Design a protein around this nucleic acid. Structure first.
Ligand SMILES: [Zn+2]
Ligand SMILES: [Zn+2]
Lengths: 114, 194, 56, 698, 135
DNA sequence: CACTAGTGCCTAAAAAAAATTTATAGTGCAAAAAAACCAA
DNA sequence: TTGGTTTTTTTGCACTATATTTGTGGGGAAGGCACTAGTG
C-alpha cells in the first residue's frame, strides 16, 4: 500500500493502464516520467484493524519511572524484570490485553496467557 | 605530541581587502549532486530580478539572438520607526536572486534565511595552508524552477472553480500534448532552431 | 492521581473508599470524597434555578 | 507580582515604544530644500518616588499608610521620566540619506503602590518602629489604599496561549475535528490572532482547509505549503508524516494532495486573493508582496514575525496538522480543556501592565496631538504633560476603585470582579481573601465544565474552600505552599541549549532522524535532538545547582518522544522532596538527612539556613502543575521506602513533604476534616469567615 | 564595463563551514580584528576521524587554548560560497523585467561542516561553563 | 495692561488594536440549492 | 436532448428567555471649553 514518487520530482505516481500491453503503469502526472507497477495491488483500505499497538516503542521505555514493573519473564531472557502497559489504541472497543517489554531482552511480547 | 599531524596557524584575511566586498553562502535543494562549473552551460549570469512570470522571460541566449537579429500632500505626516538594517534588508530582498545559464537548461531562484547566518563563520584553506576566516553576513538558499513546465495561474484559477468535481487526471498530459508553456530550455532550443 | 503507577484498575487506585469515618480517611480517599460532594453541590445549585423556571 | 511589575516591565514598556519623531524636512521636494526639521522626542530612564503627596496650597508630606487611610487619600507616589536638531539633507537627487528635550525628568503622573512592596515605607519597619507608625504587625498583606479604603485585586485564570489544542465539534456541522492556536506579544495590539484548521466531511469529503487573516476564504493547506516555498509534494508529505513506514495518514492526505494538484509555483499560490480588504493598493490581482508581508508580519505572531523564517512556519504548521490528524485517526484521544496545567493565573503584575499600556498609548496619541497643532512656535514639552498626568492618574484611580477594568468605554469588556473590597472581619477571613481566584464563564452557568473539581487540582487549590450557589466551583483558593510563576527571559536557556548540541530546524530531515526528539520552549519549536536523556539530566542538574531560575519547568514525554520547556509567567507550582534512587546505604532514600534539619532548627532558634539555603544545594525542587504527568510521588516518607487503627512500587522520585498541606486557609481550621463528610467541611469553610473575634490590634 | 556573467573559475576550492560558540564568534566576527594575523593551529590525524583546534596564546588565557572540531557532516554537497559587490557605474513574453546587475563570483565549495567545542579537559576550559551558567 | 481662575454655556472628543467568549434551545423568515415539466 | 421553467426542499439566520425572597455598601452623577473679574 506504499506510495512511490517520481525520481525527477517528489510527486505521487498515479497508476495508469497500458491499453495494449495490459499491465499497470505509474506515470508522474507532473512530468513525463512513467514507472512500472510492482504489484496488482493499487489501493488498500482496512476498514477495521488491530494494528498500531506497537506505537512509540522507544529504546528508552524502561527509563521512565511511571510505567509499572511486573515479575513476568520474557521467553528469551527469562529475567523477571519487565515493563508492561495496555493497548495504545485509545478506542472504546479496545481490549484489556497488555504488552510486556523486558529491559534485558529489549523484546516486546503479548500478555496473552493462552 | 608526536608528529602525527599537520600543524599550521590559520591566518585571517586582510582587513583592508574585506571592505566593499560582500560574501554570501550558497545552497541548492536537490537530491542529486550538482556541480555549477560542469553541469551549467557557460556563460552563466547571476542577476537580482523580479520573479513574476518566470516562464515568459526569455533566455540569455534568446536575448542575444534577438539582439543580433536586430543588428496634493496633506502637509502633516508621522512615520512609524523601523530598524535601518531591517529596512536595508527589506530593500535588498525586494527582488530575489535568480541565476541562469546561457542555455536556459537549469534555472535557480534564491531565498534568504536568517536562521544561522550570524553564528556561522567561513573557513577555507589558503594556498599556504592557512584557513581564511570570513564573517558570513548572509546565507542564501537557491531552489530549482521551471524544470517540469509548470502551468500558469489563470487557467489554474479556472480549474479550481468547482465546474468539475475533479480536474482531468490527464490535464497536464493533454497540455503537454498541446505543448503549451514550453520550458525555457525548450523555448531557447526552438529559437536556436529558428 | 500522581501517587499511583499508571494503568491500574484496582479499586484503591481508581477511587474506592475503603476505610470508614470512624477511623478516618486517607489523603486520596479524602480527595475523592471531596469530588463527590462538589458534584452534589453544583448539580443542586443549578437544578434549583432550572426547576424553578419549569414550576413557574 | 507587584515587585516584578515595578522593577521591570515598566522601563521595558517605555523603552519599547520610546520613539516619536517629526522630521519636517520640507514636506514637499523644494523649497530648496529645506532643512531636515527633526522633532525628535524619546524617553530614557524612568524614575519612581516614595509615596510623597502634597495637599492644596502646601508643602509635600512624607505620607504613611494610616495617614492616607484616615484622610481618604490614595497611597500613591509620583513619576517623572527623562525626555530627549542635527540633520541630514537631500534635494531630489540624490536621496535615501535625507534624515527636542527643553527639560529633563518631566513629571508624568502618579500611580498607586502595593503595601510593603519594594517602595513602601512599611517593607523595612521594625516592630518598635512599626508600632511608632501605629499599625498592627500582623497586617501581612498587599492591599491598596484608594480614597481611604482598603482595596484588593483578585487573580483571573485564563487558558494558556500559544499551545496546540484540538476539538471534536458536533456531528451536524460539516467540520468534525478542529485545531486552534492563540497568540500574544505581551501585549502590543493584543495580538489575539486566532489560527484554526478545520477538517471537512464525514459524506467522505476529506479535505483540510485553514483560516488565516486577513484571508476570508477557507484555504487548502497544500496551497499554503506551496506559497510558503515548498513546491515538491513529497517534501510537504515529509512535513506531515514522520514514520515513512506508516501509510494511513498518507491515504487521508491523498485527497488534500489532489486538491492542490493544479498550482505548482509559490507566488502563484500566493496570488490567491484572500481579500477581506483593505482597499486594493498597487495591484494586478493580488500583490505577491502583499501576501508575503501578511505571512511574515502578521501570521503566527509567535515563533517569528520578521521576514525570513518560512521553514520554521512550515514545520510548526505541519506539526499542528499531524496533531489534528491523530485525533481523526483515534490514535490519540480528545483534548481536555479543563486540565489545570494548561491554564494560567493572571495577577497584579500583568493586569497593571495592561492598564498602563492602554493609558500610555492614549498618552502617546495625545502627545502627537498638540505637537502637530503647534505648526508655529513653540514646542511645549511642559504643560500638556500636566493634563496627561491627570489622565494617567485618573485612569488608574478609576480602574482600581470602580472595579470596571478599562477606560471609560461604557463598561465594554469590563468584567467587574477585579478590584473587590477587602474583607476585614476575622484575621482568618482576611487571609482567606488574599489568595483568591476567579474566572468568567457566564451568568447562569453550565453543568459539565469546570465547576466540578478535577484531578489536576491536587495539591494546588484547596478542595473544600469554595462558596456555594451560582458561583460554586468558580471561585477557588490556593493551597498553602502554592506559589505563582513570575516568568523569566528564555534567551539564555535557548542559547545554552543550542550550544550543548541542537539541530536547528533549518537543516532538519526526517530520514536521518527516525528517532530524534523534538524540543519545545514556551510552545515554540526550536530544534530536534538525538539523545534526550543526557540533556534531561544535565538540565535537571543545572537547575538543582541554582544556575537557572527554579520556576522553569521541563517535561520529557518519552512516550511521545517530546521535550517541553516552560518559563512563562503565571504558572502554579508547589514544593517537593527530591529522592535519589541511588543509595550507598542501600535501596532508595530521599536526599535530605537529619543534619540539615538540625541546622534548620538551630537557625530558627537563633532568633543561617533559609528555605532558599535549602534550595541551592539540591534538596527540594519546585513542581509546576504540568510536570506531574512524569513524576511518581510517595505520600509518606516511609510508606514504602523500606522493604486496629486504620488501613495504611519501588521507583519513587519525590515524596510529599506533608499531606495535611493540601488544604487552604479556612479548611485548615477544621479539626480532623478526614473524619466527617466533605460537604459538611465545605459548609464550615464558607461559614467560618462570618465569625467575629479580632481582626487587627490597632 | 565588467562582464555581467559570474566567474566560474574560483569554484574549485574546498571550504569548511564552522559553527562557532558565541564567546569565540563575538571576538572573531568583530571587524576591528581580522588584520590577517594568525589566531590558532589545527591538528589532523593521519588516520583521520579526529580533529582538534590548537588556539594561540593571543586569547589572553580567558578562553580554552584547545578545542575539538567535530565534522557534523563529513561529506557536503550543493553548498558553496559566492561573493557579491557593486558593479562599476502561450508564447507571449514579458519585455520589461527590471534586471538589477551586481558583480558576482563563486569562490569556493563547502566540503566539511564542523563545529568548535571547548575541550573540557583544557585547563582554561570549564570557565566558560560557569559563564554560560550565569547567563 | 496682562494671566489665570470662577463660573456659565454647550457640543463633541472620529481613534481602530481587535470583532470576545458565555449556551441552548426552539421557530418563524429568507434565501439557496436541488428536483420535476416541457419546450425549443 | 437539454436547458429554461416552476416547485420544493433545505439550510441558514435571526430571533428571546432564561427559581423565589430580603439586606448592605460602594460607587459617582458631564466634561470641555468660553467669557469675563480680580490681582499682580
Ligand atoms: Zn516527476
Ligand atoms: Zn528476553
Amino acid at each position: 500500500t506504499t506510495f512511490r514518487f517520481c525520481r525527477d520530482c517528489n510527486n505521487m505516481l498515479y497508476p495508469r493502464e497500458d491499453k495494449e500491453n495490459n499491465r499497470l503503469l505509474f506515470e508522474c502526472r507532473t512530468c513525463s516520467y512513467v514507472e512500472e507497477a510492482g504489484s496488482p495491488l493499487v489501493y488498500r483500505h482496512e476498514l477495521i484493524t488491530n494494528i498500531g499497538e506497537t506505537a512509540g516503542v522507544v529504546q528508552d521505555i524502561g527509563s521512565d519511572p511511571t510505567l509499572p514493573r511486573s515479575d513476568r519473564e520474557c521467553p528469551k531472557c527469562h529475567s523477571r524484570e519487565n515493563v508492561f502497559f495496555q493497548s495504545q489504541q485509545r478506542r472504546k472497543d479496545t481490549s484489556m490485553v497488555l504488552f510486556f517489554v523486558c529491559l534485558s531482552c529489549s523484546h516486546i511480547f503479548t500478555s496473552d496467557q493462552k | 605530541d608526536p608528529n602525527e599531524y599537520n600543524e599550521f596557524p590559520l591566518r585571517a584575511i586582510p582587513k583592508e581587502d574585506l571592505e566593499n566586498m560582500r560574501t554570501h553562502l550558497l545552497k541548492f535543494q536537490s537530491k542529486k549532486k550538482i556541480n555549477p562549473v560542469t553541469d551549467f552551460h557557460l556563460p552563466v549570469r547571476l542577476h537580482r530580478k523580479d520573479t513574476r512570470n518566470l516562464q515568459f522571460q526569455l533566455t540569455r541566449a534568446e536575448i542575444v539572438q534577438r539582439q543580433k537579429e536586430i543588428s496634493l500632500r496633506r502637509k502633516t505626516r508621522q512615520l512609524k520607526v523601523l530598524d535601518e538594517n531591517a529596512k536595508k534588508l527589506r530593500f535588498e530582498e525586494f527582488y530575489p536572486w535568480v541565476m541562469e545559464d546561457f542555455d536556459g537548461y537549469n534555472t535557480w531562484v534564491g531565498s534568504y534565511e536568517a536562521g544561522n547566518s550570524d553564528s556561522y563563520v567561513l573557513l577555507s584553506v589558503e594556498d599556504d595552508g592557512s584557513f581564511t576566516m570570513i564573517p558570513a553576513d548572509k546565507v542564501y538558499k537557491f531552489t530549482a524552477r521551471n524544470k517540469y513546465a509548470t502551468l500558469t495561474i489563470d487557467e489554474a484559477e479556472k480549474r479550481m472553480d468547482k465546474k468539475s468535481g475533479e480536474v482531468p487526471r490527464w490535464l497536464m498530459k493533454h497540455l503537454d500534448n498541446i505543448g503549451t508553456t514550453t520550458t525555457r530550455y525548450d523555448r531557447t532550443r526552438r529559437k536556436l532552431k529558428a | 492521581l500522581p501517587h499511583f503507577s499508571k494503568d491500574d484498575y484496582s479499586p484503591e487506585s481508581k477511587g474506592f473508599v475503603e476505610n470508614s469515618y470512624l477511623r478516618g480517611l486517607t489523603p486520596q480517599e479524602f480527595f475523592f470524597h471531596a469530588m463527590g460532594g462538589r458534584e452534589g453541590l453544583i448539580d443542586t445549585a443549578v437544578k434549583t434555578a432550572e426547576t424553578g423556571y419549569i414550576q413557574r | 507580582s507587584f515587585n516584578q511589575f515595578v522593577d521591570y516591565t515598566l522601563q521595558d514598556i517605555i523603552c519599547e515604544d520610546s520613539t516619536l519623531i517629526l522630521e519636517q524636512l520640507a514636506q514637499h521636494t523644494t523649497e530648496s530644500d529645506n532643512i531636515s526639521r527633526k522633532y525628535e522626542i524619546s524617553f530614557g530612564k524612568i524614575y519612581v518616588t516614595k509615596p510623597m503627596v502634597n495637599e492644596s496650597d502646601g508643602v509635600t508630606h512624607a505620607l504613611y499608610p494610616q495617614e492616607a487611610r484616615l484622610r481618604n487619600l490614595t497611597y500613591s507616589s509620583g513619576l517623572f521620566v527623562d525626555v530627549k536638531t542635527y540633520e541630514a539633507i537631500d534635494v531630489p537627487g540624490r536621496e535615501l540619506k535625507y534624515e527636542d528635550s527643553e527639560s529633563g525628568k518631566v513629571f508624568i503622573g502618579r500611580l498607586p503602590i502595593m503595601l510593603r512592596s519594594k517602595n513602601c515605607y512599611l517593607s523595612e519597619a521594625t516592630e518598635s518602629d512599626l508600632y511608632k507608625l501605629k499599625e498592627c504587625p500582623f497586617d501581612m498583606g498587599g492591599y491598596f489604599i484608594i480614597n481611604g479604603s482598603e482595596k484588593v485585586l483578585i487573580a483571573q485564570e485564563r487558558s494558556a496561549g500559544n499551545i496546540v489544542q484540538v476539538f471534536k465539534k458536533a456531528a451536524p456541522s460539516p467540520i468534525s475535528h478542529v485545531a486552534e492556536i492563540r497568540s500574544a506579544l505581551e501585549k502590543g495590539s493584543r495580538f489575539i490572532s486566532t489560527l484554526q484548521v478545520k477538517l471537512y466531511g464525514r459524506s467522505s469529503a476529506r479535505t483540510i482547509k485553514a483560516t488565516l487573516p486577513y484571508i476570508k476564504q477557507d484555504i487548502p493547506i497544500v496551497i499554503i505549503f506551496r506559497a510558503l516555498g515548498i513546491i515538491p509534494d513529497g517534501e510537504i508529505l515529509e512535513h506531515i508524516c514522520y514514520d515513512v513506514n506508516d501509510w494511513q495518514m498518507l491515504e487521508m492526505l491523498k485527497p488534500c494532495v489532489e486538491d492542490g494538484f493544479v498550482i505548482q509555483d509559490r507566488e502563484t499560490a500566493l496570488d490567491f486573493i484572500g481579500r477581506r480588504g483593505t482597499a486594493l493598493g498597487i495591484k494586478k490581482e493580488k500583490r505577491i508582496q502583499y501576501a508575503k508581508d501578511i505571512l511574515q508580519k502578521e501570521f503566527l505572531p509567535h515563533i517569528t514575525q520578521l521576514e525570513g523564517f518560512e521553514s520554521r512556519k512550515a514545520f510548526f504548521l505541519g506539526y499542528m496538522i499531524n496533531r489534528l490528524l491523530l485525533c481523526a485517526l483515534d490514535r490519540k484521544d480528545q483534548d481536555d480543556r479543563d486540565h489545570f496545567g494548561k491554564k494560567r493565573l493572571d495577577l497584579a503584575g500583568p493586569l497593571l501592565a495592561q492598564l498602563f499600556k492602554t493609558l500610555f498609548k492614549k498618552l502617546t496619541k495625545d502627545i502627537f496631538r498638540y505637537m502637530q497643532r503647534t505648526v508655529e512656535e513653540a514646542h511645549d514639552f511642559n504643560m500638556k504633560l500636566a493634563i496627561n498626568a491627570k489622565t494617567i492618574t485618573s485612569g488608574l484611580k478609576y480602574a482600581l476603585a470602580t472595579g470596571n477594568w478599562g477606560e471609560q468605554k461604557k463598561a465594554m469588556s469590563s468584567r467587574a470582579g477585579v478590584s473587590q473590597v477587602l474583607n476585614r472581619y476575622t484575621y482568618s477571613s482576611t487571609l482567606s481573601h488574599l489568595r483568591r481566584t476567579n474566572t468568567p464563564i457566564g451568568r447562569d452557568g453550565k453543568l459539565a465544565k469546570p465547576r466540578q473539581l478535577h484531578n489536576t487540582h491536587w495539591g494546588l487549590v484547596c478542595p473544600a474552600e469554595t462558596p456555594e450557589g451560582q458561583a460554586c466551583g468558580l471561585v477557588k483558593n490556593l493551597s498553602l505552599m502554592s506559589c505563582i510563576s513570575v516568568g523569566t527571559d528564555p534567551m539564555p536557556i535557548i542559547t545554552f541549549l543550542s550550544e550543548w548540541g541542537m539541530e536547528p530546524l533549518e537543516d532538519y530531515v526526517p530520514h536521518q532522524s527516525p528517532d530524534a526528539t523534538r524540543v519545545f520552549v514556551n510552545g515554540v519549536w526550536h530544534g530536534v535532538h538525538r539523545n534526550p536523556a543526557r540533556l534531561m539530566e544535565t538540565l535537571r542538574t543545572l537547575r538543582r545547582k541554582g544556575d537557572i531560575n527554579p520556576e522553569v519547568s521541563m517535561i520529557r514525554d518519552i512516550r511521545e518522544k517530546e521535550l517541553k520547556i516552560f518559563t512563562d509567567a503565571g504558572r502554579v507550582y508547589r514544593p517537593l522532596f527530591i529522592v535519589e534512587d541511588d543509595e550507598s546505604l542501600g535501596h532508595k532514600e530521599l536526599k535530605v538527612r537529619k543534619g540539615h534539619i538540625a541546622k534548620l532548627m538551630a537557625t530558627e532558634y537563633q532568633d543561617e539556613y533559609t528555605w532558599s539555603s535549602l534550595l541551592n544545594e539540591g534538596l527540594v525542587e519546585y513542581i509546576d502543575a504540568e510536570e506531574e504527568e512524569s513524576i511518581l510521588i510517595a505520600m509518606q516518607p516511609e510508606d514504602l521506602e523500606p522493604a486496629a487503627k486504620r488501613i495504611r512500587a519501588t521507583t519513587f522520585t519525590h515524596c510529599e513533604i506533608h499531606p495535611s498541606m493540601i488544604l487552604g486557609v479556612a479548611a485548615s481550621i477544621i479539626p480532623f476534616p478526614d473524619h466527617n463528610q466533605s460537604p459538611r467541611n465545605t459548609y464550615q469553610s464558607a461559614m467560618g469567615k462570618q465569625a467575629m473575634g479580632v481582626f487587627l490590634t490597632n | 564595463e565588467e562582464s555581467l556573467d559570474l566567474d566560474l573559475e574560483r569554484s574549485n576550492r574546498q571550504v569548511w563551514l564552522v559553527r562557532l560558540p558565541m564567546f569565540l564568534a563575538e571576538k572573531w566576527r568583530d571587524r576591528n580584528n581580522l588584520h590577517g594575523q594568525e589566531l590558532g593551529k589545527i591538528r589532523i590525524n593521519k588516520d583521520g576521524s579526529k580533529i582538534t583546534l590548537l588556539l594561540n596564546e593571543n586569547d589572553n588565557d580567558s578562553i580554552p587554548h584547545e578545542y575539538d572540531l567535530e565534522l557534523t557532516k563529513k561529506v557536503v554537497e550543493n553548498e558553496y560560497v559566492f561573493t557579491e559587490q557593486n558593479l562599476k557605474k502561450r508564447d507571449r513574453y514579458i519585455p520589461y523585467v527590471k534586471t538589477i546587475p551586481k558583480k558576482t563570483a563563486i569562490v569556493g565549495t563547502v566540503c566539511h561542516e564542523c563545529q568548535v567545542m571547548p575541550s573540557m579537559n583544557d585547563p582554561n576550559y570549564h570557565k566558560i561553563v560557569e559563564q554560560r551558567r550565569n547567563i
